[PDB]
Symmetry: C3
Amino acid sequence: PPALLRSVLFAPGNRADLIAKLPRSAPDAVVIDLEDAVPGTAEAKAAARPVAHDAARDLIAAAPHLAVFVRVNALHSPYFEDDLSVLTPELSGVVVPKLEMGAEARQVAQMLQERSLPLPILAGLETGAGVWNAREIMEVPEVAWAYFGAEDYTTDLGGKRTPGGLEVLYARSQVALAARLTGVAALDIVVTALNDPETFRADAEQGRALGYSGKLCIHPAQVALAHEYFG
Amino acid sequence: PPALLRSVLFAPGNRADLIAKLPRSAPDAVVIDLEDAVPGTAEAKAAARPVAHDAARDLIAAAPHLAVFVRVNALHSPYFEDDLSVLTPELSGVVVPKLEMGAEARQVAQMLQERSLPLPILAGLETGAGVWNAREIMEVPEVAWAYFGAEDYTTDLGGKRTPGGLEVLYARSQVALAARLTGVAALDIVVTALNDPETFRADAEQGRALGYSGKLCIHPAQVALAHEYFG
Amino acid sequence: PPALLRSVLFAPGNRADLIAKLPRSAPDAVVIDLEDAVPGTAEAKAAARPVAHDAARDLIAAAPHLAVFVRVNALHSPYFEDDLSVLTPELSGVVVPKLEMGAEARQVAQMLQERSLPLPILAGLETGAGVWNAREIMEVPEVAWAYFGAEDYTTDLGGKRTPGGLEVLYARSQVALAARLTGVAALDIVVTALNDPETFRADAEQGRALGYSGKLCIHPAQVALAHEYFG
Ligand SMILES: O=C([O-])CC(=O)C(=O)O
Ligand SMILES: O=C([O-])CC(=O)C(=O)O
Ligand SMILES: O=C([O-])CC(=O)C(=O)O
Ligand SMILES: [Mg+2]
Ligand SMILES: [Mg+2]
Ligand SMILES: [Mg+2]
């Protein structure tokens, strides 16, 4: 995949239909999500694995030039292990959420290698420890890109999100700087307000000014908006 | 004392009458202050010790559940040593202002134990070094809560305070993050404007969004406002 | 040169005429610039050196009490070595842009010592690494002052500058804090807009609030304005 992704669009791993609609807006990359998008039960996570596996295969064959990623559950969740069975060399990479130390990313890299699944890692820095150890996490060789997850960050610190985002400015700035120092591409925060392009435009602008090279998108319409600011 | 304190109300150590009025606003915790609240004269300090002691003694008995703290003078001040003699096991904890190194916090903890005073420490992070070494200070076991003192922080850096507080956003964000990583309760900055409830409301909202679990209060009226945002 | 510089005014190193005007606004210090001010070709830099060298000399003889500095090119640039010949013992010091490690600053000090140039360093922290290692760079003994260059910082991170400057608040606050902790005087960012003193006034105000003790100036008119805020 390109070292630069201007837009990264998500779809629930257990929604074959939404996964297939992923290329419509032509995002630079997409993420079939087995984490947040799917219920936290052993049953839901198991049911989602074959669905996302086949959906990923179909998608890559239909849109050969689309960078396709799969987001697995956190390293320390009881789902990480079995999520790996979903991966294939055809994916552009694997998204690992809530990483918190360089050792965790190295563990991930080694486990992937032992499953014969050499996939670059798109690191999720979205907790206090992830931000604090941002540089150490991104210096792991296998980490090619990273996103700052404001939503989980504030939840982790017992904070609350605002439109301006001053409450995550410190964190968002640290991640962008650590990303520059390690040669890793930084992906900006999601925008949950889906009814106003203006709210998104203002947010993307802040992210661009900070040095992020791309932005996470949760709705197709945000893709075109993202391309007006990154790239 | 509770792990979380929504409000912490201050009262001058040498003002036995005000100390007694403390329970009125029903704050989660109160601080009998021998530091800033009293004049910096070797005589005005030694004269405040007996008044603070006797006032704290009677206050704790009058409201046994209420978390009662006494703020002593800085570790390297000429008053610290003698201030300790004022403390008692019945206190919920001791407030130590201007801590700047993990080593200073450990020193305080050791001295307290040697004086047979089992008191958890409420660390004052309000200087450049305090903020810089926030995590190292807060990881000391005896430290249970910590507050960011914007007033003395700006004074220490030669800065100046504003209503928006952007000049201490980096510092306030760093303390909140370090508090999370160490399991320490973070207490937000004071609001010196005692005539406008909107200034406090907006200020408290910023602290809450950043991850603070409580806020320092200098006037009984701010207590109710604090509980509107923290809890 | 005093430990405190409220204003530091720049002039192109290849303009003998502009350099001569430097003393008119009575800035606390002046900088004859061989770096950004002079085009990036071996021809333009070599042509600039004798002018900066002699103009600096004529300046010191005319204004004996003025702190005169020369800004050489970056340490790892192909012009650094030759730029050193422009320096003389009579200068108040030398500005070294884009410093990124403590070791780089020590290298400069060493090379200055072997040339018999007792010139303290005014370090330029204006790239991701410069900000990341701000404290280590400033703890180098010969570093007496440091400036934060928001322009090159955002360029280095691939961001964009805004009037409000929230995109560089993190870095600006960090440089100011590190300067306090190392005993180094921190100089605030340049203001490129010259048609409005109000834009400069608001900016200087932000810098002062964060703890900066002086501000870089690129137009003599900014000198008096800086003096209203610093000192
Ligand atoms: O799942 C989503 O839609 C967005 C997400 O995880 C994130 O921004 O971290
Ligand atoms: O004593 C006060 O009024 C305020 C105080 O200590 C602080 O903000 O740290
Ligand atoms: O060259 C200039 O005029 C200003 C400059 O380098 C800076 O602010 O770093
Ligand atoms: Mg997320
Ligand atoms: Mg205080
Ligand atoms: Mg510069």
